[PDB]
Design a protein around this ligand. Sequence first.
Ligand SMILES: Nc1ncnc2c1ncn2[C@@H]1O[C@H](COP(=O)(O)OP(=O)(O)OP(=O)(O)O)[C@@H](O)[C@H]1O
Ligand SMILES: Nc1ncnc2c1ncn2[C@@H]1O[C@H](COP(=O)(O)OP(=O)(O)O)[C@@H](O)[C@H]1O
Ligand SMILES: Nc1ncnc2c1ncn2[C@@H]1O[C@H](COP(=O)(O)OP(=O)(O)O)[C@@H](O)[C@H]1O
Ligand SMILES: Nc1ncnc2c1ncn2[C@@H]1O[C@H](COP(=O)(O)OP(=O)(O)O)[C@@H](O)[C@H]1O
Ligand SMILES: [Mg+2]
Ligand SMILES: [Mg+2]
Lengths: 145, 48, 48, 948, 145, 145, 194
Amino acid sequence: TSIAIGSAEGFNQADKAINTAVKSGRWVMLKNVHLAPGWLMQLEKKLHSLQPHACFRLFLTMEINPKVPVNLLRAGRIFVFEPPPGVKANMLRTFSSIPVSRICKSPNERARLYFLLAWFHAIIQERLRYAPLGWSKKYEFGESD
Amino acid sequence: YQYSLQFFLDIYHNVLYENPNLKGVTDHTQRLSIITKDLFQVAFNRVA
Amino acid sequence: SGFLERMNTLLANGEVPGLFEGDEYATLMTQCKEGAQKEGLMLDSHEE
Amino acid sequence: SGKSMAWRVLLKALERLEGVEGVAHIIDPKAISKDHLYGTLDPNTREWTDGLFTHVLRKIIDSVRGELQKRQWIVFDGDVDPEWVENLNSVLDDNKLLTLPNGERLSLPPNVRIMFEVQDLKYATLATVSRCGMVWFSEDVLSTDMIFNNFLARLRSIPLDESPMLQIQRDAATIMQPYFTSNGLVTKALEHAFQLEHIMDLTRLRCLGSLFSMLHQACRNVAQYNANHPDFPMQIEQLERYIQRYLVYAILWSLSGDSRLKMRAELGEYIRRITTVPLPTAPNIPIIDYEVSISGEWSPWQAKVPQIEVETHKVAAPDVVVPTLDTVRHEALLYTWLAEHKPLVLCGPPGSGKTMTLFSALRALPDMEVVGLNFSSATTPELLLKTFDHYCEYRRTPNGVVLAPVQLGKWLVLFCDEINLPDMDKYGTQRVISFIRQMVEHGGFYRTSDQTWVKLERIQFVGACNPPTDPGRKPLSHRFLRHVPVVYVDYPGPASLTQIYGTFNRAMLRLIPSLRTYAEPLTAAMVEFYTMSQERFTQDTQPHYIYSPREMTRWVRGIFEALRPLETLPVEGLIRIWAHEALRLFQDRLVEDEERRWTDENIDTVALKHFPNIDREKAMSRPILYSNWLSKDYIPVDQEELRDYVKARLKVFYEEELDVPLVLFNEVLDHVLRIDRIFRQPQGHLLLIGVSGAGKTTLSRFVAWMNGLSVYQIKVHRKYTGEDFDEDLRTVLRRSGCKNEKIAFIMDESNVLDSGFLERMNTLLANGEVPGLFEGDEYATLMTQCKEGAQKEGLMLDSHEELYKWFTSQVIRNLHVVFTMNPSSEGLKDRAATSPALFNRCVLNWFGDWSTEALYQVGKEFTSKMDLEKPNYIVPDYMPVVYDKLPQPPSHREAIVNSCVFVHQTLHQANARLAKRGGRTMAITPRHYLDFINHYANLFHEKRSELE
Amino acid sequence: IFTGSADIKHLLPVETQRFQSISTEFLALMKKVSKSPLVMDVLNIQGVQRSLERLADLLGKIQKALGEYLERERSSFPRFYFVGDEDLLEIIGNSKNVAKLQKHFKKMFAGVSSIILNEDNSVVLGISSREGEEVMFKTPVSITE
Amino acid sequence: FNRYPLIIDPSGQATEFIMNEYKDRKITRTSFLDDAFRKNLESALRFGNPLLVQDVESYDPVLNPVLNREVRRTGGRVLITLGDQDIDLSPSFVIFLSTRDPTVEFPPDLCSRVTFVNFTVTRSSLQSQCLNEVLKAERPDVDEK
Amino acid sequence: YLTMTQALEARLGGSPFGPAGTGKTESVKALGHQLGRFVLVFNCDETFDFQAMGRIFVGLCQVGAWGCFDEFNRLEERMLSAVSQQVQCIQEALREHSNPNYDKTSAPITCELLNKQVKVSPDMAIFITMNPGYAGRSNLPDNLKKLFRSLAMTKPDRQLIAQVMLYSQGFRTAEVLANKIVPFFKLCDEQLSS
Ligand SMILES: Nc1ncnc2c1ncn2[C@@H]1O[C@H](COP(=O)(O)OP(=O)(O)OP(=O)(O)O)[C@@H](O)[C@H]1O
Ligand SMILES: Nc1ncnc2c1ncn2[C@@H]1O[C@H](COP(=O)(O)OP(=O)(O)O)[C@@H](O)[C@H]1O
Ligand SMILES: Nc1ncnc2c1ncn2[C@@H]1O[C@H](COP(=O)(O)OP(=O)(O)O)[C@@H](O)[C@H]1O
Ligand SMILES: Nc1ncnc2c1ncn2[C@@H]1O[C@H](COP(=O)(O)OP(=O)(O)O)[C@@H](O)[C@H]1O
Ligand SMILES: [Mg+2]
Ligand SMILES: [Mg+2]
C-alpha cells in the first residue's frame, strides 16, 4: 500500500494501512514524509511500541532534508539514492532495472539499442557532475527519461 | 548520518552468527581473523 | 410549597414559563441553538 | 500623481458622453486577508463562501439589477504582491476567467474593467505586468499649481460651516492667492523643506494637506471672532493682516513640524529672507516661537506659558501638564488638526509627551471621545473592528451602511499608540495601515461578513509612534502619510525639564516647610542624574535601556508618596528618599554589575554636588531600604530588622499558602521590597527577568500574600489553546473588575503558547480592558455583574457604557500582572515588538542569576546545621577565593562554603566549553545549587552517622 | 426543485417541510398582491418589509442546506461539476423556464453559449456560439419526451 | 535525587531498570502523549505509587507544581494543585521522566525542575559488551563458566 | 505538439514550463482545440488542496475534458505530494482504455477519486504549466514529476507570429512590417530605461 503524506486524509490512511499491515505481513510505503516532520516524530514513537508480523515492512520515502527528525533516522535503516558514481556504475544500474525479457524480445538488434541507450544515459548523467562544462545547467535527466 | 547502538550491534551479531565465511571453520584463531576482517567489511557496507 | 408549583408545571408541560429570565434565557437560547444544530435542525427563532 | 482623479473624472465623463452609467468598486486588496478577498472553501462541509472581489464580480455577472448594462470598473487601490494578484492571471489574460478552487469559473463580462491604482510595482512579477495595460503617472503630471488651484477653488465654493462663512473664505482666498502662485512663497518654502531632515519621509501632499487644514481653521477663527463681536465684524485690513501671518505660521508647522528644532529654525530664516509678510523683529528668537493673534499681530508663545504653582496633591499626577514652550505650541497645532477631524500622527522618542499633549489638547476640544488602541507587531485590522463593535453601531441607511459612535453628537477618536509597529510582510505592506488609509482616503471599509461597504461617520484617527529608525519600527507608507500631518515631539531639554519638575518639586516640598529651600538643588540633581543615565545607557547596549521624562515623573511621585505622611524630615532624610527612588528607577533594570556599580557611584556624586554640608553616611548608607512593613508609614528600614520580619512572615506563609522553604539572602530582601512597591501602585505591572528557579514566581506569590492580593496562574497543558486563555482572561477580569478583588496575575513566558496570548495582554496592560474579550452572552453577563458590583460601591451606574468604564477603572486599580521570563538577548529584543506594553507599562526588575554573594549567603545559611568546624585547619598561602568579601583569615566553614560557590560556577565554565565546541548544554540554575547543598547536608549527616 | 423531484422529500425531510412552510407564507403574500397590485397598497401591508426580510433569510438557509443534494445531481450530468451551487439550483429549479438556462451554457461547454429552441421551447433545434455561429442538429432533441 | 530525575537513555535499559527496581511498589509506565496520562498521574499522586512517564520531549506543563513540590498543608491535609483540581499528595509518590532522544533540547524552565541522568555508552562498557558477546558465540563453554 | 502528444500516448500528463508570456497555456488549449477537446483552465493557488483537486478531477474524468492547471507550482508542497496519488490512479485507468484486450461492451473503466469509484473517459487529460524560475514557488516532488512529460518553452518565435498575423489581417507588407516590429520591441527592451 503506497500513500502520499501531505494530505490530512493521507495521515489517516497511513495509520490504518500500517495497523492492518502489522497484523498481516503487508508492506506499506509512505512517500515524501519529509513534508510532515511533526507527524514523523509521532510515527517513530508508534513504531517503537509495536511487534508486527515477521513479513511486515515499512518504507519511508523522503528527500535528504534536515527537517527529518533525528529520532526517526536512528530507528530506521538509511539508504541513500543518488546519481551513480560513474559511467560503469550508471550502466550496471540501468541493466539491472530493465527486465531481461524486455531486452531479449524477437528483434535481436533490440539488445544493442538498449546498450546504446544505456551508454547515452550514462554519458548524459555523468556530464552533470561537471556542473558548468558538461551542461550549462543542472538538468534532471533521470529514470523517467 | 544517525546511527544507534542497536544498528552496530546488529552488524556485530551478523558477523558472529550469520557469517558465510565461518561455515566450516573450526580453529578458534582462524575464526577470530575471519570475524575481525568481516566486522570491518559489514560495518562499511551497511553504513555506506 | 413553591417547589411543587414549579414541578406541577414541569410535569404537565415540560416547561416552566418564568424559570429562565434575563441572562439565563439568553444563555439558554445560545445552548438551544447549539443543541438543535447537532440534531440537524435549522432552528434560529427564539420561539422555535 | 493624479491617478485617482484621472479615472474618477474619466468615469463621469464617459457617463455624460456615452449615456452609460459608470460604477466603480474600489477595493484595497491588502487591507483584508486573501481569504476575504477571493473566498474560502470550508474544510469540512466543502461549502464555498465568496470573497470581496468574487462577490462583486458575481453580482455583475448575475445582473439582477442591470449591472451588465453599466460600465463596471473594479479598482484595486493598494499594494500589488504576487500572493494575491496572481489569482487574476486567468482574469487578466485572454481567458477572462476567474477560477475558484470549488471548480467554478466566472467569465469576465465585456463591460467590466479590472484596474489597479498603485504607487509602485517593485514586488509584481512579469506574469502580472505583461498581462495589463500600463499608464504611468509621474509627480510632474500633477503640478503644485494644480493642487493650489484645487484648494482655492474649494475654498471659494464649499462653505466650511456645513454665506457669512463663505464670504470669509472668499475674502481670505483673495489674500492667499498671491502666495499660492507658481514660484510663490509656498512653492519656494516647499522646495526648501525637501532639503531638510524630517522624522518621517516628506511628501508634497502631507505638507499641503496639513497647510490647507490649518488655513481652513484660520477661516473658522475669523468667523468665531465675528461671533464674539456681533457689532464689528473683522474688516479686510484686519482680515488681510491676520491671513498673511497665519499663512507663514501654517507654512512653518506644515513643513517643519515633523523636524527637530534646528530644522524648524532653519526654515524660519529662509522664509524670513524670501517673504514680504511682516515678521517678528526679535534678534535671535525663531519664528516658530510666535503665534498669530486674531488681531493680525505676532504674539510670542511665551505669553501663554505662565510659571504655575501646582496644588500639592496633584504633584506629578498623570493629568497635570506644566506649561512649557513646546506644550503650548504642540497643543495649538494639535487643536487645529483635531478640530478639522484631520488624521494626525505624533512622532517622538518613547516618553516625550505625545499622549500627554494629545490628551491635553482633547480637553480643550469637547464633544470628542478618545479610545486608546495599543498596536503591537501582531496588530491586524481586527483590533480596530472590535473597537468599532464596542463603541459604534452599524445602521442601515438608504445610501448604505453607516458606522457611527453609539453616543450621539460626539466625534470618536481612535488613538493608536504604536501605529508603526505592526508587522510588515515580505512585500512591504502593513495590513492595518492599508486598512486605516482606506478609512481615511475612502471614508470607510468593507464588512467582510456580507461584502458590504460601510461608511464612517464622526470617527477620526490619531496615531502615535516612535521614529521609524528605531528597532522594530517600520516606515509608514507614503499613500498613508499624504493624509496624515506629522508633528515631532522631542524630549524636553534641560531647561524645560527644570521648569517642569522644578514646579513639581516646589509643590511637593510644601509638605515639609523646613525643606522649601532645597527645591532647586533637588531638581538640579534630578535633571543631572537623569541626563547622565540617559547618555550612559542606551538601546544599543540593551533593548530596555530607555530613559524618558516618565522616570522623572515617577521620581517626583515616589518622593512625594514617601513624604505625605511625614510631619518633618531633615535634608539628609530627603536625600535618602531621593537616592532610594533613583536606585528603583535606574538601577533595577540594569543587567551588568558594572552598570549597577556606575549607577550606585554616580548617585552619590550627583547628590553631594548639589547638596553640600550634609552628613554623607546618614543620607547615603549603601543598604538603602524602605518599607511600610514595620510601621504605618513608608520609612527607611534596617536590613536586619527587615530580615527578622520576613522570616516571621515566611513562617506563616509556609503554613497557609506554599510549604516550600526558602533561604533568605540579601538580594531576596531587596527583591521583595521592589515587588511590594509595584503591588501598591495602580496598574502596577511587573516584568521579572531572571534564570528559572531563582524564585521569581515564589517571591511574587509571597509578596502578593503579604499585600492581600490573590494569585492567579493560568493552568496550561498540552491542549491549552487561545480560547482557553480568553476564558481565563474573562475569569480574572470579572473577579478584579466586578468583585473588587485585588489579583496578582502571574504568568510566565512558557505560558505563552501562541502569539495571540500577548496581543490580549498588550491591550490589558495598557488600557485595563480588551475590546473584544466579552462578546455575546459574556458581555450581557458582565453587564449584570458590573451593575451588581457598582451597587455595592454606592454608584448609580445603569448605562452599559457607564458600567464598562467603571469595570475598566476597577481592573486598572485591582489587576496586577507579573511577567516572568528568562534573559535572552534575541528574545528580549524581539519581545518589545510583540508586547510593547511589557516595556513601557510594566516595571522591569532584572533579577538575573544568583550572584556570587547570593550563592555564598545561601551556602553559609544552609550549612549552619552542618558541623564544619575544624579548629586545626590551616589557611593556605594562596587561597582559591571566589567570593570577593570572603574574610581575609577564612575559617574552615568559610572555606567550605567558598568551595561550594566555586563548584557551581564551574558548571557555567563547563557549559561554555561544550557550547563553544557545538556540544549540547543544559541550563545551570540556582535549583542546581540548592540541590547541591541539600545533598551535601544529607550525605554529611549520613556519613558521619554511619562512621560513628 | 421541491416539486419536480419527489426523491428530495425523502432525502431531506426537514428541508422539504421547512420550504413548504415558507412557500405557504410566500403564496399568501402573493395573493394579497393580486387583490391590490397598486404599489402603495403593497407598501402599506403590515410588516411587509419584515416579512420579506425573514423570507430572504429563511430561503437562504434552505439554499445552503441543498448542498449534498446538488452533489448527487452533478453525477447525472457531469458538466454540472463546473457550475456553482447557486447556478446549479437555478438550472435544476428552472427546468421548465428554458430561457433562464441560456446564461449557464458557457460554464458547461467549450463553445456553446446558447441553444436554439422552437416557438414552444419544447424542442432543442441546435446550439449557438457567443459570436452568433449556429449548429443545427440533424435530429432535434425533444424536451417534452 | 532531590529533584525528580529526567532519564536520557536511547538504548532503553534505564527504562527497564526503573521498572525492575519498582515492581514491588507497583510502578506504572505511561507517556505524555497517552490519553490516560492525567488519570495515571492523578492516581499515582493520590495513592503514592511510582510513575514512569516517557516521551518527555512532549512535556506537559501540568507537572509544573508537582516538579516544584508546590504543596499546601492546611487542615491536616497535604494538597497538590493539579490543574484546577486539588489532590491529596501521598508521601510515597515518585515520578521518573524519560526520553530516548539524546539530542533533544529542553527549555531552561524544565532543566531547573529535573535531575538529568544521562545514559551514554562508554568505551569500556561497549568493550565489555562486545567481549562478552563474542565469548558467547565462540566459546560457549567458557562464557557459561 | 509533438511532446504533449507523446505524453498523451504514454498516458502521461503534459508539463510545459518556462518564463511568462511564452505561449505555455495557449499551446495546451490549441492542442486541445485541435483534437476537439473541452479544455478547462484553472488558475491554481495554495487553496487548491487535495480535496479541491480531486473534485475537479472527478468532473474532468467523467466529462472527458482536459484540465490545464496553470501556476500549478503555487500549490503547497504537501498538497502536490497528495495530488500525485490522484493523478497516478487516473493514469492507470487511462491505460485500461488503451488495452486491446479490453472491449467497449464491458464494465466501464473506473478509478478511485475521493474514496469513490469514478468513471474515466479516455478523452480526458491533465496538463500543468509552471514557471520554475519564480522564487518562492513550491518544488514538485519527484514522484509527481515522473507523471508528467516536461517541455521547455522559453523563446517564442516572435517574427513568425508577427508575420502570419499581419498577413492574415490583410497587410500587404506583412513581411516588411514583421521584420521591423519584432526587432523594434527588442530594441525597446534594451534602449529604453529599466
Ligand atoms: N487635475 C487635477 N487638477 C487639480 N487638482 C488635482 C487634479 N488631480 C488631482 N488633484 C488633486 O491633487 C491631489 C491628487 O490626488 P489623487 O488621488 O488624484 O492622486 P493619486 O496619485 O491617485 O494618489 P495616491 O497615490 O495617494 O493614491 C488631490 O489633492 C487632488 O484633489
Ligand atoms: N510639560 C510637562 N508637564 C508635565 N509632565 C510632562 C511635561 N513634559 C513631559 N512630561 C512627562 O513626560 C512623560 C510623557 O509621557 P507620555 O505622554 O505617555 O509620553 P509618550 O506619549 O511620548 O510616550 C510623562 O511622565 C509626563 O508627566
Ligand atoms: N530563595 C530560595 N531559597 C530556597 N529555594 C528557593 C529559593 N528561590 C527559589 N527556590 C526554589 O526554586 C523553586 C522554583 O521557584 P520559582 O519561584 O518557581 O522560580 P522562578 O520563578 O525563578 O522560575 C522553588 O519552588 C524552590 O524550591
Ligand atoms: N504560437 C502563437 N501564436 C500566436 N499567439 C501566441 C502564440 N504563442 C503565444 N501567443 C500569445 O502570447 C501570449 C501569451 O501566451 P500564454 O499561453 O498566455 O503564455 P504563458 O502560458 O507562457 O504565460 C498570448 O497573447 C498568446 O495568444
Ligand atoms: Mg489614488
Ligand atoms: Mg500561462
